[PDB]
Symmetry: C3
Subunit: 360 residues, 3 copies
Amino acid sequence: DNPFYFNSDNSWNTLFKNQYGHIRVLQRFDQQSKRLQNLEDYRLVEFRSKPETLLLPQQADAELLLVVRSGSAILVLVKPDDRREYFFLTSDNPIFSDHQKIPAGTIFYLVNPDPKEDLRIIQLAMPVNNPQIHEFFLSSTEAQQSYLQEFSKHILEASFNSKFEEINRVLFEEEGQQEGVIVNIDSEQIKELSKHAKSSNTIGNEFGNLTERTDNSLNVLISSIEMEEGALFVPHYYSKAIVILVVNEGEAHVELVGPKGETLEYESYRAELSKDDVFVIPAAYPVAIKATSNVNFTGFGINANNNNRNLLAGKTDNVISSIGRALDGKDVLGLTFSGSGDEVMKLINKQSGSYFVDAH
Amino acid sequence: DNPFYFNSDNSWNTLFKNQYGHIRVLQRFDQQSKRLQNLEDYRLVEFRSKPETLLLPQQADAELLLVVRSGSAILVLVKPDDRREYFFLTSDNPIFSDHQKIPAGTIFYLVNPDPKEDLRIIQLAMPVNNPQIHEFFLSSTEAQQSYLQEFSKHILEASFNSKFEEINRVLFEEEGQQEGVIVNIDSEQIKELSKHAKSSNTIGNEFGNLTERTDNSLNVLISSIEMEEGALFVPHYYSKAIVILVVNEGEAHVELVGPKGETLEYESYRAELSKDDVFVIPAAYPVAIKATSNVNFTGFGINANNNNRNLLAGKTDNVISSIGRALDGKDVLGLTFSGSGDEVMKLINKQSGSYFVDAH
Amino acid sequence: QDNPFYFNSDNSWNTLFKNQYGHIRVLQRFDQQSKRLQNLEDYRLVEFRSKPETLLLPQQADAELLLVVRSGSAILVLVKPDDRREYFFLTSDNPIFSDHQKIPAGTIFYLVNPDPKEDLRIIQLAMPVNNPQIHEFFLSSTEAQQSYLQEFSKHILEASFNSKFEEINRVLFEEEGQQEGVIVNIDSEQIKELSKHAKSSNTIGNEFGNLTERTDNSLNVLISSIEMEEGALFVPHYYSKAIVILVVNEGEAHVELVGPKGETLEYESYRAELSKDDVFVIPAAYPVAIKATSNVNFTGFGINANNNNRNLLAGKTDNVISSIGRALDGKDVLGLTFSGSGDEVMKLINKQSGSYFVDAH
Ligand SMILES: *[C@@H]1O[C@H](CO)[C@@H](O)[C@H](O)[C@H]1NC(C)=O
Ligand SMILES: *[C@@H]1O[C@H](CO)[C@@H](O)[C@H](O)[C@H]1NC(C)=O
Ligand SMILES: *[C@@H]1O[C@H](CO)[C@@H](O)[C@H](O)[C@H]1NC(C)=O
């Protein structure tokens, strides 16, 4: 049992699915292991839809950080005081962004504008009430009942100022209802939206690339890691951030050194990652990742404010060289390892690359 | 059973009670049910006093947010470096405030200076040490010993520089101690205290009124609610604040919608409310309140900074009308409900009311 | 069980490492002792000791540390990945250098005991990031422990270092050349350059005792130091909001804490006889008194300290009871509170001319 590896064949839970797309939530982290109890308050939600579709109005009881891991998207957030907000999200093109935070209980709807590409979304959610994520759909479809349908009849009459039959016909009539929450929209309607919506760094080399961005407000960090077959992300550790990794495409070998099960005895937690798999990396635990195929991930780092990336090989951000460069440093290295301070520095300098190495 | 309902008849517990007043504490929220886990840190204290009384000095291990739900009170804070803070609180006259935060561990005493009216107080507590709330009384009365009496004879003689017998005669002697912590005081005493003390937005209509106040630093809000008999507070929800309702006087019928037991299936949680009953309205969960008689509530909303009030019926703060005014609002609403967008838009317009409605 | 706030050194510390040169101990979890101590689930104490002229090999831990020197001197160096370093000289008593420093989570660091005759005693508060356990990753390869480097695959180490595993093993891990442990002995001459640059980079008390506190506003934690003459008393008092953790550095003391019987209006006295390395917890707003039974010195940490206030129940300074007496109605109020009359109690409160610390022989 590698308690930090979440296989896709078990970890995700289908919430919705139809010919046009699907929604799944990842299982509680702390339920998998108590060693992951500081991740109790965080949950993952994944979404996928075919071209030209619309996700109907809803509001969830969690703070969402929506990331587009493929395609484009039109997001419109609706405010109770007659105000609206539009955002055009695209995973690549440097003109538009690929993430947007959505405040708890804010009604929003999503559109996949492209006629060819699918919208692939991954999001960090942070529930308000208790650790479970609750989505309140306003729609009445074949798949689900609208929440207004839960209140009592005269409460509905007295509110809307109409007779139930009128209110029902216009709102709830089984006839006329759409099938599910992911609906197929028409090309004409969305050109108008897209237009208005549209009006509104990296470290890598031959073998890989790494792009991170930190949201000081949420105290969260968002990465993008691309690696080509045979590449290697040399051993390293993130000082303060807890890192949640997700395979978007590809497969890779992961090696994590954690505590053996409060001692000075280690143990390795090796795993073989593939599409939709999620791997957790605790703050300060060393890790190395090698591309078994071309692979790209998206990661969320929690506790991101003032985090340092410490590398254990290569020319850039190497802490061992740094130790060797302290005032009486070489003497420290010679006592740390079996060689001499000179010998270790010699070895530490053989490698000419930084971050992403070739491992074959 | 409804996990959000706290029946006064069996949810409060008496700390102290005597011919002049009482103090009871509400049971733990997370104990009634795990759904209520993000409330494990808060508590509700209730206290009522007869006219012209004093609550003897004490300090508690919790932050208090005190609220006059009926009557008037003279609150005084005693700081160690020869300082006091005098506050005059009342429920109705717009000249004085109706609430006051009391920092943890601060010595304070209370007075009901009125010669005819009783004092009714409701307060939100945030214990510092663990889930329990601890009150340390300085007083020595027939109902309780002073905490000073838990110290050893030699610690006491040394501290005060007096033989244990002097100390006993002045501070603890049985003959002279009041009967309990609530005390009957004379009108002439509270005369000069009143002077000294006194020198130191609403939405509604004929059917009911709502008055809300947000304490930015505490990130908590207080709501006062009065609805005439037969009035309805139409279906609404709050984006992020989890709400705790308390009935001060009167009767009401409530319906809250939420998750049936992580899915899309809902459930209705209804309840018939009366005095001192408590009801938890989770953030983002739709709710409606129908007044069975003339009723007055007091509410505490926690995790309130930036919370929004989403209404589902009427002229003010209606989300549904706002979705209609979006770019292709009508088309979205069209796909959201059975009716066309023009139809549901016209429907939403029949109710001229806002917030409170006639439902006699 | 009996007294949930007392932690006997004998059965409360677990040894992480120990050898001829020094040792590292970790205190048992606060919550694991008593459910009453719930709000300290995420806090820990680590204790360390060193012989004169010793070095503690590099390591990074997954906890934010607040290091405090309880005796001796130390040179602390923090190593950053961007070719940057931070040097600190720490001492316990001479008012010229600091006695404490905070080490952020995941920062590589190493400590030296420059002194040729004195030991180095450190007490430290830890706030773990991952879960309640505190983990320490040692970079070193010694008879005692292997380096976390040794835990990756040979081929990954080869690709990483661009070296054949035989040379990688030679130069780094060969046991035919490693030290016996993580606390190692050094030469005064070796640290010649270091020490130089290191060295180049609130009290209320009387004849009976001295209190010295400081508050790291960023961390919302308070640091106290108490010294008391044998036979002295820190009269009854309480902290309004801070939860205080007390550690006996040297000496013996008698403590009396007044808490609840288990929400009643019934109190109960929790008492103990403290001595070297015992930890005693003092909850926010719970009354307490300490009688020094031998010359004694304490170091304590105060969590949830921003805005805290000290309330004494006896003495001429910070006396809350006299402060009630001087209120617009005070005397009337004090007369109903206690058995005697307001003038009578007010008379008694003034017999004690001392403040904070009092003679109790
Ligand atoms: C990332 O990797 C590719 C392939 O090695 C390289 O051409 C590219 O310049 C790198 N950086 C960016 C920003 O694409
Ligand atoms: C406020 O609410 C009460 C209760 O329904 C109502 O009777 C009263 O007319 C309202 N009036 C004003 C001025 O707010
Ligand atoms: C502090 O307390 C000590 C120890 O009890 C006392 O002897 C000393 O003189 C006090 N004052 C100063 C300045 O140290």
